[PDB]
Paper text:
However, the parasite also displays members of variant protein families on the surface of infected erythrocytes, including the multidomain Plasmodium falciparum erythrocyte membrane proteins 1 (PfEMP1). These PfEMP1 cause infected erythrocytes to adhere to the surfaces of blood vessels and tissues, removing them from circulation and protecting the parasite within from spleen-mediated destruction. ICAM-1 binding is mediated by a subset of Duffy binding-like (DBL) domains, the DBLβ domains, which are found in either A-type or BC-type PfEMP1 (26–29). To understand how these BC-type PfEMP1 interact with ICAM-1, we have determined the structure of the DBLβ domain of the B-type IT4var13 PfEMP1 in complex with the N-terminal domains of ICAM-1, revealing divergent, but similar, modes of ICAM-1 binding across the PfEMP1.
The DBLβ domain from IT4var13 formed crystals which diffracted to 2.17 Å resolution. The IT4var13 DBLβ domain adopts the classical DBL domain fold, consisting of an α-helical core decorated by extensive loops. Comparison of the unbound and the ICAM-1D1D2-bound DBLβ domains showed little variation in structure upon ligand binding (root mean square [rms] deviation of 1.07 Å over backbone Cα), with variation predominantly located in loops (residues 805 to 809, 833 to 840, and 1107 to 1117). Secondly, a loop from the DBLβ domain (residues 1107 to 1117) interacts through backbone–backbone hydrogen bonds with ICAM-1D1 to add an antiparallel β-strand to the A′GFC β-sheet of ICAM-1D1. In the unbound DBLβ domain, this loop adopts a different conformation which is stabilized through crystal contacts, indicating that it is flexible and becomes stabilized upon interaction with ICAM-1. This is analogous to a different intrinsically disordered loop that becomes ordered to form part of the ICAM-1 binding site of A-type PfEMP1 (22).
Numbering used by the authors: 733 to 735, 743 to 785, 790 to 956, 964 to 1172, 1181 to 1200
Amino acid sequence: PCVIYPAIANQMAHQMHEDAQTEASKRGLAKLRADAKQGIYKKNRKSNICNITLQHSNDSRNGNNGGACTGKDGNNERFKIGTEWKIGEKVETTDTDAYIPPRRQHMCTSNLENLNVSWVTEDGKAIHSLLGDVQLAAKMDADEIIKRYKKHNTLTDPIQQKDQESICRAVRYSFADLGDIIRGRDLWEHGDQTKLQGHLQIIFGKIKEEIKKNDKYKGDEKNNPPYKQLREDWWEANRHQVWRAMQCELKNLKKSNGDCHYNSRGTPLDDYIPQRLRWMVEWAEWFCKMQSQEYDKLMKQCSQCMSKGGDCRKGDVNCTSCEQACEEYKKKIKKWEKQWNKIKDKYEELYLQAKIAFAGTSFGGGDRDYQQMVHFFKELQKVTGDTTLGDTTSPYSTAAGYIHQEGHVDECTEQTQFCKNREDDNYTFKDPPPKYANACKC
């Protein structure tokens, strides 16, 4: 049901992590353990990871231009409430769409986009040189998230508890996105990302020959993405050192429990949740921030037209400002609602195909994440018992149910239910607000 069922996504992610660990052990997980200090950067043959600088990078550009955040978020939109998510610049079919989070679009990966593949591989230490640039991007992106979140929301120095958790989640989303970029699972197709993926395909080609000194990855260049298994194993071997680079900045926050409980101990499991589901949960959080802000504008502009003995005549300025505030509310909620209808339809299509595709049968796929989505939903349906057409006992059968099980929608005010029925008053996309239906009419 959309409207107590246990939340199990995180325990499912733990299962995916164990499977990746054991499968890497059968191959060359041990030969892929890297150390940034053992790499060579800009041909320099000469401590704490939190002291990594711009010199420990193979960005092929001059000083002050080879930073990881170089030229990112020129309009300061990354963490501004109300920024509209836009579709990927996929020009081939456009039948398939996934909305890009503003945090992801302005991610600090510029050093990785402008790598010199010779400097990374010519010395035969591409395993260690790649980790240095990944750790540099992870640390600078985490630092930029903390500062720009406080800037774009004008957060005073005593940060509230809910804003600290929101910042901690954003850093976990960035850690998961970076793992999907390295492994080739990331869904954003763009000019800069195509160039970035091209560098990794050359680097990991040399890596396959670097550790080849039997071959545990025969035919891995035939996989899609190229070197799929070798890149999954490299991530398993070094994912914790990547999160350690992000912990250098998270320790400056005071909250240490809740979603911030990985700041000083442990490694989060977000990188094993399919990216299409992570972005949906992030879409719902930022929709609720926009909705709550627009709702406050409606409470103040229409405050006078609420009581039968108010101060709001049907032609005066208080009624006019209230009707104009209702019009702006309906327009913003409607355009966000159009995005949700495409998101929830794709969710349901993948969920239905998961419980139907047998061992030897398949629907064809086509999407970059089809296999990862079907496998995740199959293991979810196996635990919950929802394996036939007709079972409506699990909330995970709809996107709205997934949000209410795993999402963070406490900031939605009065309009909190992401499903219509089971029409309703507390529906998030209700065009006439039940509390202000009469206020907009004066």
